[PDB]
Amino acid sequence: KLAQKMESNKENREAHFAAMLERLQEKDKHAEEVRQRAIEENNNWIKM
Amino acid sequence: MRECISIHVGQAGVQIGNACWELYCLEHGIQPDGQMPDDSFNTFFSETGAGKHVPRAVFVDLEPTVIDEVRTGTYRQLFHPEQLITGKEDAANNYARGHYTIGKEIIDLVLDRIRKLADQCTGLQGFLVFHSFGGGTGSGFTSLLMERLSVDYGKKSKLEFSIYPAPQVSTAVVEPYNSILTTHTTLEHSDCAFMVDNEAIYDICRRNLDIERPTYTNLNRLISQIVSSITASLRFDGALNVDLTEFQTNLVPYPRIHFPLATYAPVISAEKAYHEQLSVAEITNACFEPANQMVKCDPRHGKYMACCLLYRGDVVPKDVNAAIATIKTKRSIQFVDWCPTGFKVGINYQPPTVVPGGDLAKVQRAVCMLSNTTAIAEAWARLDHKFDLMYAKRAFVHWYVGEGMEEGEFSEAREDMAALEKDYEEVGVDS
Amino acid sequence: MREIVHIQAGQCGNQIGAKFWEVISDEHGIDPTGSYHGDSDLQLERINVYYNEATGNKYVPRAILVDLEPGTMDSVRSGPFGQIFRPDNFVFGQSGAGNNWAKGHYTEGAELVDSVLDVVRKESESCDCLQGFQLTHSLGGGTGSGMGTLLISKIREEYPDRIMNTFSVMPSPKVSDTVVEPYNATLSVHQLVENTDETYSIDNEALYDICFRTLKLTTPTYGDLNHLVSATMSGVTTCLRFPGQLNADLRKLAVNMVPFPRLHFFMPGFAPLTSRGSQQYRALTVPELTQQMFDSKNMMAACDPRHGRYLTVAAIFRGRMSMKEVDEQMLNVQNKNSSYFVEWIPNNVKTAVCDIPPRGLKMSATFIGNSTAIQELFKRISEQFTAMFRRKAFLHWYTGEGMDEMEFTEAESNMNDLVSEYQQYQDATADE
Ligand SMILES: Nc1nc2c(ncn2[C@@H]2O[C@H](COP(=O)(O)OP(=O)(O)OP(=O)(O)O)[C@@H](O)[C@H]2O)c(=O)[nH]1
Ligand SMILES: Nc1nc2c(ncn2[C@@H]2O[C@H](COP(=O)(O)OP(=O)(O)O)[C@@H](O)[C@H]2O)c(=O)[nH]1
Ligand SMILES: [Mg+2]
């Protein structure tokens, strides 16, 4: 009774922190992306 | 022989425990080091090879602050260090942290200590659990512990001394949530629970003891007196006694309707000297006054199902029966139609003992009435309404969900409380 | 719950942070060498919340000092309590942020961030039980704002279960060093809504108005504004650093103050209002202290509390006074001003009394309110932002750093949603 209440709990906090880092890691994937773009456009400018 | 294990959970439970054990020591003549210069006190105190008397108790808190005071205090030698258990991180007024997140780390250690105490018992009667409804430890850890105790102890008696929250002394906005969650989870695991409304105690201290701004020290001394009255029958051998089982048999007619109302008298200030000595009639009359109640509610608007009167000190059976007879002539005390025998009376020889330097005056005779009244449902209704106000907006719910709790657990807990209120209503109807 | 790790970022962050440390060191009886010379056991009871105990009788602030510019750090070291700080805890760059959020958040700030995390990890791993973090910074600048929010995100990644607290100073045209402050503030607010558990909204608009109108200081300086900030910071942290029942730790404070995750922006208030020089003063009774809770004149955020409703309130009284009088006065205010408190959060006003008053005052009161009126501060920023953004003015400073227009649109929309959310609960009823 308790096993299938605390396991169902441990799953519902791993999720409420999975959805955290997963959705606050693409928050670094985008900060890499526009950051690559930052000196990329600066380079292809000197290409002209 | 007939041992009782006391468990003190969270700040409220631990602090009330300090007051109770201080009072028990004064009553049995036990010094703060466990030394002492009847024999029934052995139900609550074990004895070591050095002739020292040790409380059959476990003190638990998820934060160390409160218990650290016990292990530095006057009674540091009374308890063995292993029976004072503390974590590092508190439950932060969150039932989910107490029950799940933080509680799950210390639960096994607490049960191992309780097992060691139970192994020293030849006839363990069961447990007395002290906790607040409002704190994260008092609510969350208690329900976790109660569930685990039912597993390990089969059908061993479990009685509660629950601190019902009051806004005058409340520390969290989320106390109604914690109160409902703990009541739902603990209901199927508790045999009998004595609620103590902090507002009722706050008002008695203000009105009867002339304390302008009552502190937990003031509240706990008064609480300790009621706990001592309930437990005196176990710790002493008087003319009329009641064990763990007889309390339940006389006061609990149905499994879920296990919440008796406590009323204590007299509560006299340590000044005056003229305001005494009160007769058996006077103290008995005081039990039927809503001002002396431990929970705020109106019995005149409810129905009684059982009334237990626990007298202490210079009390004679003839005096008691005379007092009960005059009270019976006051038509206003209504009982349910399926209940004939209303009054169970107990007399314990020892007059109430008071803490030196305390607010309470020394009296020759006192009484504690335990009554199972449908009027106690009013306390559940007040709590349920505060829960509903916040829950309709899901205010603060994210704190519990974040700890792994599901919203469904809130609905389940509230539906169970609705069923409890419905049970008190059904019980008061005539056939 | 024990240790709090303090972080100071940017010019404003370091200036306000340094003042916080000199104010609290004086309250805890700690001199500029780290030695305790006080005469009250209450001063040391919870000393470990902000200080590490070093070899012998010495106490060291658990503080990390950060800037992309070196000058501010030198000014801190040269200061009165400058020598108290851990030398290894000063983390500074050489290439500043030039009041550009993009430089602080993506470029220069990103290059320094790891050196800062290395120092925060050292302090965090030393902790018996880390409560979380406390950051002081401005939202109008580049380092405090951009790097500060970058640090919040990086710390949150490594410590997702710890409490994240900030003292965020809002920019104002009244005391402005740059025309781009609405952009920097909006971009930062977007970050704080998502990444902090609690934010004290310290408004320069309100601080300037208090100095000019109330303190009668014709030309306020940052020194004058910072005197109000340090009085507020001392007040709001009283519960964390002295023994008490209410809001004793960062989590308990958040649990009592935050009903909805995003609505974690507090409106601080303080009474009595004093100027640096004013060591007079002879005034302030309990009814007088209590009345200033609804007084817009005493708010550290330029919002009228009577323009909204309080979701939750924490009130801290300091000095030798009657607890009975405080309880009566506090109940009177809630009964008289019923309409300014939400009915669906019962007993939402919590009071604490600390015997130790702040320096110079015998009696003081600090208010922490979670009010729907804070939407006035966010509306002000959104309207200043839109006036500029409509014309794409100064956008080249940000796009030049690799930023896209979408981030600006998103930050603005998120802040407007926050305003809309405050309005929703302002209009909500207990009709059930
Ligand atoms: N009568 C009485 N009530 C108390 C005492 N201490 C706390 N309470 C009440 O209990 C509630 C607060 O819960 P606590 O027991 O302090 O908290 P806790 O169990 O330690 O849980 P956490 O601190 O959240 O981990 C409020 O209703 C208080 O008024 C006490 O010594 N006596
Ligand atoms: N209250 C206060 N505000 C300041 C102080 N210094 C700068 N500011 C404000 O902070 C903003 C400018 O940011 P600043 O901290 O100088 O830039 P940074 O070094 O890149 O973080 C503006 O809103 C200024 O009005 C200070 O000491 N006190
Ligand atoms: Mg506690």
PDB file of C-alpha atoms in Angstrom, chain C residues 193-420:
ATOM      1  CA  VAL C 193      10.179  34.854 -13.256  1.00  0.00           C
ATOM      2  CA  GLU C 194      11.506  31.458 -14.308  1.00  0.00           C
ATOM      3  CA  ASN C 195      14.606  30.979 -12.122  1.00  0.00           C
ATOM      4  CA  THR C 196      14.212  32.498  -8.632  1.00  0.00           C
ATOM      5  CA  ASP C 197      12.075  31.369  -5.673  1.00  0.00           C
ATOM      6  CA  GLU C 198      11.873  34.870  -4.158  1.00  0.00           C
ATOM      7  CA  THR C 199      12.844  38.338  -5.373  1.00  0.00           C
ATOM      8  CA  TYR C 200      12.897  41.548  -3.356  1.00  0.00           C
ATOM      9  CA  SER C 201      11.907  44.263  -5.884  1.00  0.00           C
ATOM     10  CA  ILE C 202      14.162  47.230  -4.737  1.00  0.00           C
ATOM     11  CA  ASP C 203      13.024  50.175  -6.909  1.00  0.00           C
ATOM     12  CA  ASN C 204      15.369  53.155  -7.544  1.00  0.00           C
ATOM     13  CA  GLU C 205      12.210  55.157  -8.486  1.00  0.00           C
ATOM     14  CA  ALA C 206      10.903  54.679  -4.910  1.00  0.00           C
ATOM     15  CA  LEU C 207      14.371  55.205  -3.264  1.00  0.00           C
ATOM     16  CA  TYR C 208      14.900  58.478  -5.154  1.00  0.00           C
ATOM     17  CA  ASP C 209      11.370  59.689  -4.284  1.00  0.00           C
ATOM     18  CA  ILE C 210      11.893  58.861  -0.551  1.00  0.00           C
ATOM     19  CA  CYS C 211      15.272  60.756  -0.511  1.00  0.00           C
ATOM     20  CA  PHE C 212      13.972  63.776  -2.419  1.00  0.00           C
ATOM     21  CA  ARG C 213      10.406  64.076  -1.022  1.00  0.00           C
ATOM     22  CA  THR C 214      10.683  62.629   2.506  1.00  0.00           C
ATOM     23  CA  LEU C 215      14.359  63.026   3.481  1.00  0.00           C
ATOM     24  CA  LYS C 216      14.467  66.458   1.734  1.00  0.00           C
ATOM     25  CA  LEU C 217      17.772  65.651   0.014  1.00  0.00           C
ATOM     26  CA  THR C 218      17.783  67.984  -3.027  1.00  0.00           C
ATOM     27  CA  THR C 219      20.384  65.884  -4.899  1.00  0.00           C
ATOM     28  CA  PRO C 220      20.354  62.226  -3.738  1.00  0.00           C
ATOM     29  CA  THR C 221      23.569  60.174  -4.226  1.00  0.00           C
ATOM     30  CA  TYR C 222      23.921  56.366  -4.503  1.00  0.00           C
ATOM     31  CA  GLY C 223      25.148  56.609  -0.870  1.00  0.00           C
ATOM     32  CA  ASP C 224      21.758  58.103   0.164  1.00  0.00           C
ATOM     33  CA  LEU C 225      19.779  55.475  -1.850  1.00  0.00           C
ATOM     34  CA  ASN C 226      22.005  52.618  -0.474  1.00  0.00           C
ATOM     35  CA  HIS C 227      21.291  53.686   3.124  1.00  0.00           C
ATOM     36  CA  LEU C 228      17.598  52.818   2.486  1.00  0.00           C
ATOM     37  CA  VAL C 229      18.585  49.532   0.695  1.00  0.00           C
ATOM     38  CA  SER C 230      20.823  48.394   3.588  1.00  0.00           C
ATOM     39  CA  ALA C 231      18.076  49.235   6.177  1.00  0.00           C
ATOM     40  CA  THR C 232      15.623  47.123   4.131  1.00  0.00           C
ATOM     41  CA  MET C 233      18.090  44.202   3.613  1.00  0.00           C
ATOM     42  CA  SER C 234      18.838  44.141   7.341  1.00  0.00           C
ATOM     43  CA  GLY C 235      15.071  44.109   8.096  1.00  0.00           C
ATOM     44  CA  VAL C 236      14.028  41.376   5.623  1.00  0.00           C
ATOM     45  CA  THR C 237      16.934  39.066   6.777  1.00  0.00           C
ATOM     46  CA  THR C 238      16.283  39.535  10.564  1.00  0.00           C
ATOM     47  CA  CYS C 239      14.233  36.287  10.699  1.00  0.00           C
ATOM     48  CA  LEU C 240      17.048  34.287   9.026  1.00  0.00           C
ATOM     49  CA  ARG C 241      19.854  35.545  11.268  1.00  0.00           C
ATOM     50  CA  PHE C 242      18.375  35.705  14.752  1.00  0.00           C
ATOM     51  CA  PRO C 243      16.481  33.006  16.746  1.00  0.00           C
ATOM     52  CA  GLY C 244      12.775  33.020  15.872  1.00  0.00           C
ATOM     53  CA  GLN C 245       9.619  31.000  15.150  1.00  0.00           C
ATOM     54  CA  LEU C 246       8.445  32.594  11.930  1.00  0.00           C
ATOM     55  CA  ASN C 247      10.168  32.456   8.499  1.00  0.00           C
ATOM     56  CA  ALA C 248      13.392  31.227  10.210  1.00  0.00           C
ATOM     57  CA  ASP C 249      14.837  29.855   6.898  1.00  0.00           C
ATOM     58  CA  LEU C 250      14.617  30.573   3.147  1.00  0.00           C
ATOM     59  CA  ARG C 251      12.257  27.651   2.412  1.00  0.00           C
ATOM     60  CA  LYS C 252       9.764  28.448   5.253  1.00  0.00           C
ATOM     61  CA  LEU C 253       9.715  32.066   4.066  1.00  0.00           C
ATOM     62  CA  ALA C 254       9.004  30.974   0.471  1.00  0.00           C
ATOM     63  CA  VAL C 255       6.313  28.443   1.559  1.00  0.00           C
ATOM     64  CA  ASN C 256       4.510  31.220   3.549  1.00  0.00           C
ATOM     65  CA  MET C 257       5.000  33.939   0.910  1.00  0.00           C
ATOM     66  CA  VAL C 258       4.590  32.264  -2.513  1.00  0.00           C
ATOM     67  CA  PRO C 259       1.100  30.910  -3.383  1.00  0.00           C
ATOM     68  CA  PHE C 260       1.792  30.563  -7.109  1.00  0.00           C
ATOM     69  CA  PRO C 261       5.290  29.825  -8.501  1.00  0.00           C
ATOM     70  CA  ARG C 262       5.652  32.899 -10.765  1.00  0.00           C
ATOM     71  CA  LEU C 263       4.257  35.385  -8.192  1.00  0.00           C
ATOM     72  CA  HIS C 264       7.430  35.603  -6.129  1.00  0.00           C
ATOM     73  CA  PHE C 265       8.182  39.385  -6.405  1.00  0.00           C
ATOM     74  CA  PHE C 266       8.069  41.145  -3.069  1.00  0.00           C
ATOM     75  CA  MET C 267       7.318  44.732  -2.268  1.00  0.00           C
ATOM     76  CA  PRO C 268       9.494  45.669   0.742  1.00  0.00           C
ATOM     77  CA  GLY C 269       8.551  48.429   3.154  1.00  0.00           C
ATOM     78  CA  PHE C 270      10.398  50.127   6.010  1.00  0.00           C
ATOM     79  CA  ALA C 271       9.562  52.449   8.943  1.00  0.00           C
ATOM     80  CA  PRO C 272      10.884  54.863  10.178  1.00  0.00           C
ATOM     81  CA  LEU C 273      12.475  56.494   7.154  1.00  0.00           C
ATOM     82  CA  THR C 274      15.909  57.955   8.059  1.00  0.00           C
ATOM     83  CA  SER C 275      18.769  59.762   6.249  1.00  0.00           C
ATOM     84  CA  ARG C 276      22.497  58.825   6.648  1.00  0.00           C
ATOM     85  CA  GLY C 277      23.195  61.899   8.803  1.00  0.00           C
ATOM     86  CA  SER C 278      19.930  61.711  10.815  1.00  0.00           C
ATOM     87  CA  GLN C 279      21.004  60.217  14.179  1.00  0.00           C
ATOM     88  CA  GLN C 280      18.444  62.387  16.036  1.00  0.00           C
ATOM     89  CA  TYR C 281      15.360  61.375  16.183  1.00  0.00           C
ATOM     90  CA  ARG C 282      12.889  60.697  19.127  1.00  0.00           C
ATOM     91  CA  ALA C 283       9.761  58.985  17.581  1.00  0.00           C
ATOM     92  CA  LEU C 284       7.908  55.811  16.512  1.00  0.00           C
ATOM     93  CA  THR C 285       5.408  53.926  18.660  1.00  0.00           C
ATOM     94  CA  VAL C 286       3.754  50.535  17.844  1.00  0.00           C
ATOM     95  CA  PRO C 287       0.544  52.069  16.268  1.00  0.00           C
ATOM     96  CA  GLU C 288       2.814  54.476  14.278  1.00  0.00           C
ATOM     97  CA  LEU C 289       5.069  51.593  13.008  1.00  0.00           C
ATOM     98  CA  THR C 290       1.986  49.506  12.018  1.00  0.00           C
ATOM     99  CA  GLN C 291       0.257  52.327  10.101  1.00  0.00           C
ATOM    100  CA  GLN C 292       3.186  52.645   7.648  1.00  0.00           C
ATOM    101  CA  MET C 293       2.456  49.085   6.204  1.00  0.00           C
ATOM    102  CA  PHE C 294      -0.240  50.575   3.893  1.00  0.00           C
ATOM    103  CA  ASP C 295       1.781  53.781   3.483  1.00  0.00           C
ATOM    104  CA  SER C 296       2.915  54.059  -0.109  1.00  0.00           C
ATOM    105  CA  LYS C 297       5.513  56.623   1.199  1.00  0.00           C
ATOM    106  CA  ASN C 298       7.327  53.758   3.031  1.00  0.00           C
ATOM    107  CA  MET C 299       7.466  51.283   0.081  1.00  0.00           C
ATOM    108  CA  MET C 300      10.835  50.319  -1.521  1.00  0.00           C
ATOM    109  CA  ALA C 301       8.937  49.509  -4.783  1.00  0.00           C
ATOM    110  CA  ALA C 302       7.166  52.488  -6.467  1.00  0.00           C
ATOM    111  CA  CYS C 303       3.627  50.954  -6.127  1.00  0.00           C
ATOM    112  CA  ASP C 304       0.651  51.961  -4.010  1.00  0.00           C
ATOM    113  CA  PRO C 305      -0.385  48.929  -1.882  1.00  0.00           C
ATOM    114  CA  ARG C 306      -3.942  50.370  -1.821  1.00  0.00           C
ATOM    115  CA  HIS C 307      -4.058  49.948  -5.648  1.00  0.00           C
ATOM    116  CA  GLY C 308      -3.989  46.151  -5.146  1.00  0.00           C
ATOM    117  CA  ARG C 309      -4.462  43.327  -2.642  1.00  0.00           C
ATOM    118  CA  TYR C 310      -2.006  41.477  -0.428  1.00  0.00           C
ATOM    119  CA  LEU C 311      -1.737  37.784  -1.145  1.00  0.00           C
ATOM    120  CA  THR C 312       0.663  37.299   1.823  1.00  0.00           C
ATOM    121  CA  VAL C 313       2.478  39.641   4.278  1.00  0.00           C
ATOM    122  CA  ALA C 314       5.406  39.116   6.636  1.00  0.00           C
ATOM    123  CA  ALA C 315       5.963  41.867   9.171  1.00  0.00           C
ATOM    124  CA  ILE C 316       9.102  42.133  11.356  1.00  0.00           C
ATOM    125  CA  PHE C 317       9.166  44.453  14.373  1.00  0.00           C
ATOM    126  CA  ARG C 318      12.520  45.305  15.925  1.00  0.00           C
ATOM    127  CA  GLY C 319      13.344  46.836  19.294  1.00  0.00           C
ATOM    128  CA  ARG C 320      12.037  46.728  22.862  1.00  0.00           C
ATOM    129  CA  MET C 321       8.201  46.790  22.620  1.00  0.00           C
ATOM    130  CA  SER C 322       5.020  45.000  23.777  1.00  0.00           C
ATOM    131  CA  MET C 323       4.178  41.789  21.833  1.00  0.00           C
ATOM    132  CA  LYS C 324       0.551  42.246  23.018  1.00  0.00           C
ATOM    133  CA  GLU C 325       0.458  45.827  21.523  1.00  0.00           C
ATOM    134  CA  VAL C 326       1.991  44.524  18.216  1.00  0.00           C
ATOM    135  CA  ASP C 327      -0.636  41.719  17.972  1.00  0.00           C
ATOM    136  CA  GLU C 328      -3.543  44.187  18.686  1.00  0.00           C
ATOM    137  CA  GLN C 329      -2.236  46.815  16.226  1.00  0.00           C
ATOM    138  CA  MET C 330      -1.632  44.172  13.514  1.00  0.00           C
ATOM    139  CA  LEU C 331      -5.133  42.691  13.916  1.00  0.00           C
ATOM    140  CA  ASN C 332      -6.675  46.201  13.830  1.00  0.00           C
ATOM    141  CA  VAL C 333      -4.972  46.956  10.477  1.00  0.00           C
ATOM    142  CA  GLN C 334      -6.279  43.737   8.865  1.00  0.00           C
ATOM    143  CA  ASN C 335      -9.842  44.342  10.183  1.00  0.00           C
ATOM    144  CA  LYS C 336      -9.896  48.058   9.155  1.00  0.00           C
ATOM    145  CA  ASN C 337      -8.254  47.403   5.767  1.00  0.00           C
ATOM    146  CA  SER C 338     -10.117  44.077   5.023  1.00  0.00           C
ATOM    147  CA  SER C 339     -10.500  45.033   1.348  1.00  0.00           C
ATOM    148  CA  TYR C 340      -6.708  45.084   0.744  1.00  0.00           C
ATOM    149  CA  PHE C 341      -6.176  41.400   1.750  1.00  0.00           C
ATOM    150  CA  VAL C 342      -7.327  38.355  -0.314  1.00  0.00           C
ATOM    151  CA  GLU C 343     -10.149  36.443   1.474  1.00  0.00           C
ATOM    152  CA  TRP C 344      -9.193  33.056  -0.056  1.00  0.00           C
ATOM    153  CA  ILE C 345      -5.843  32.836   1.819  1.00  0.00           C
ATOM    154  CA  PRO C 346      -6.829  32.637   5.530  1.00  0.00           C
ATOM    155  CA  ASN C 347      -4.491  34.128   8.215  1.00  0.00           C
ATOM    156  CA  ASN C 348      -2.166  35.452   5.452  1.00  0.00           C
ATOM    157  CA  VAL C 349      -0.399  38.069   7.658  1.00  0.00           C
ATOM    158  CA  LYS C 350       2.387  36.700   9.844  1.00  0.00           C
ATOM    159  CA  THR C 351       4.234  38.815  12.469  1.00  0.00           C
ATOM    160  CA  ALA C 352       7.627  38.401  14.161  1.00  0.00           C
ATOM    161  CA  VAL C 353       9.301  40.525  16.887  1.00  0.00           C
ATOM    162  CA  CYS C 354      13.078  40.711  17.411  1.00  0.00           C
ATOM    163  CA  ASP C 355      14.476  42.373  20.578  1.00  0.00           C
ATOM    164  CA  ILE C 356      17.584  43.652  18.683  1.00  0.00           C
ATOM    165  CA  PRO C 357      16.841  46.954  16.854  1.00  0.00           C
ATOM    166  CA  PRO C 358      18.984  48.018  13.818  1.00  0.00           C
ATOM    167  CA  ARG C 359      21.794  50.574  14.362  1.00  0.00           C
ATOM    168  CA  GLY C 360      20.739  54.152  15.148  1.00  0.00           C
ATOM    169  CA  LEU C 361      17.090  53.219  15.843  1.00  0.00           C
ATOM    170  CA  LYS C 362      15.468  52.045  19.102  1.00  0.00           C
ATOM    171  CA  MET C 363      12.375  50.877  17.172  1.00  0.00           C
ATOM    172  CA  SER C 364      11.801  49.744  13.572  1.00  0.00           C
ATOM    173  CA  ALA C 365       9.432  47.805  11.342  1.00  0.00           C
ATOM    174  CA  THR C 366      10.041  45.882   8.142  1.00  0.00           C
ATOM    175  CA  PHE C 367       7.325  44.753   5.853  1.00  0.00           C
ATOM    176  CA  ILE C 368       7.553  42.070   3.113  1.00  0.00           C
ATOM    177  CA  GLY C 369       4.471  42.025   1.001  1.00  0.00           C
ATOM    178  CA  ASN C 370       3.345  39.851  -1.836  1.00  0.00           C
ATOM    179  CA  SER C 371       0.904  42.449  -3.331  1.00  0.00           C
ATOM    180  CA  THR C 372      -0.938  42.463  -6.678  1.00  0.00           C
ATOM    181  CA  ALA C 373       0.015  46.232  -6.821  1.00  0.00           C
ATOM    182  CA  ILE C 374       3.600  45.179  -7.856  1.00  0.00           C
ATOM    183  CA  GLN C 375       2.079  44.999 -11.399  1.00  0.00           C
ATOM    184  CA  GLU C 376       2.537  48.865 -11.442  1.00  0.00           C
ATOM    185  CA  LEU C 377       6.337  48.410 -11.338  1.00  0.00           C
ATOM    186  CA  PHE C 378       6.226  45.809 -14.212  1.00  0.00           C
ATOM    187  CA  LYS C 379       3.788  47.952 -16.285  1.00  0.00           C
ATOM    188  CA  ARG C 380       6.224  50.915 -15.938  1.00  0.00           C
ATOM    189  CA  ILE C 381       9.090  48.773 -17.289  1.00  0.00           C
ATOM    190  CA  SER C 382       6.911  47.364 -20.136  1.00  0.00           C
ATOM    191  CA  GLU C 383       5.778  50.813 -21.301  1.00  0.00           C
ATOM    192  CA  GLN C 384       9.402  52.177 -21.232  1.00  0.00           C
ATOM    193  CA  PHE C 385      10.508  49.015 -23.097  1.00  0.00           C
ATOM    194  CA  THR C 386       7.773  49.295 -25.794  1.00  0.00           C
ATOM    195  CA  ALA C 387       8.506  53.041 -26.401  1.00  0.00           C
ATOM    196  CA  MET C 388      12.047  52.012 -27.422  1.00  0.00           C
ATOM    197  CA  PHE C 389      11.274  48.584 -28.984  1.00  0.00           C
ATOM    198  CA  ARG C 390       8.469  49.999 -31.236  1.00  0.00           C
ATOM    199  CA  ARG C 391      11.247  51.966 -33.018  1.00  0.00           C
ATOM    200  CA  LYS C 392      13.912  49.213 -32.527  1.00  0.00           C
ATOM    201  CA  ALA C 393      16.086  51.910 -30.900  1.00  0.00           C
ATOM    202  CA  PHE C 394      19.511  50.761 -29.614  1.00  0.00           C
ATOM    203  CA  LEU C 395      18.744  47.226 -30.816  1.00  0.00           C
ATOM    204  CA  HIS C 396      22.107  47.115 -32.673  1.00  0.00           C
ATOM    205  CA  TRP C 397      23.883  46.974 -29.276  1.00  0.00           C
ATOM    206  CA  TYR C 398      22.175  43.639 -28.586  1.00  0.00           C
ATOM    207  CA  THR C 399      21.967  42.130 -32.108  1.00  0.00           C
ATOM    208  CA  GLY C 400      25.640  43.015 -32.449  1.00  0.00           C
ATOM    209  CA  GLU C 401      26.258  40.566 -29.567  1.00  0.00           C
ATOM    210  CA  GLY C 402      24.427  37.771 -31.431  1.00  0.00           C
ATOM    211  CA  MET C 403      20.958  38.309 -29.978  1.00  0.00           C
ATOM    212  CA  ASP C 404      17.745  37.903 -31.942  1.00  0.00           C
ATOM    213  CA  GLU C 405      14.615  40.137 -31.908  1.00  0.00           C
ATOM    214  CA  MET C 406      12.508  37.126 -30.719  1.00  0.00           C
ATOM    215  CA  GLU C 407      14.218  37.114 -27.289  1.00  0.00           C
ATOM    216  CA  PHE C 408      13.072  40.745 -26.811  1.00  0.00           C
ATOM    217  CA  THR C 409       9.462  39.890 -27.899  1.00  0.00           C
ATOM    218  CA  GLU C 410       9.471  36.807 -25.583  1.00  0.00           C
ATOM    219  CA  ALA C 411      10.848  38.652 -22.522  1.00  0.00           C
ATOM    220  CA  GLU C 412       8.215  41.415 -22.992  1.00  0.00           C
ATOM    221  CA  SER C 413       5.364  38.915 -23.465  1.00  0.00           C
ATOM    222  CA  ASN C 414       6.451  36.957 -20.380  1.00  0.00           C
ATOM    223  CA  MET C 415       6.513  40.145 -18.262  1.00  0.00           C
ATOM    224  CA  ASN C 416       3.041  41.185 -19.564  1.00  0.00           C
ATOM    225  CA  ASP C 417       1.758  37.693 -18.637  1.00  0.00           C
ATOM    226  CA  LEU C 418       3.115  38.260 -15.123  1.00  0.00           C
ATOM    227  CA  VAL C 419       1.147  41.574 -14.952  1.00  0.00           C
ATOM    228  CA  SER C 420      -1.981  39.751 -16.267  1.00  0.00           C
TER     229      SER C 420
END
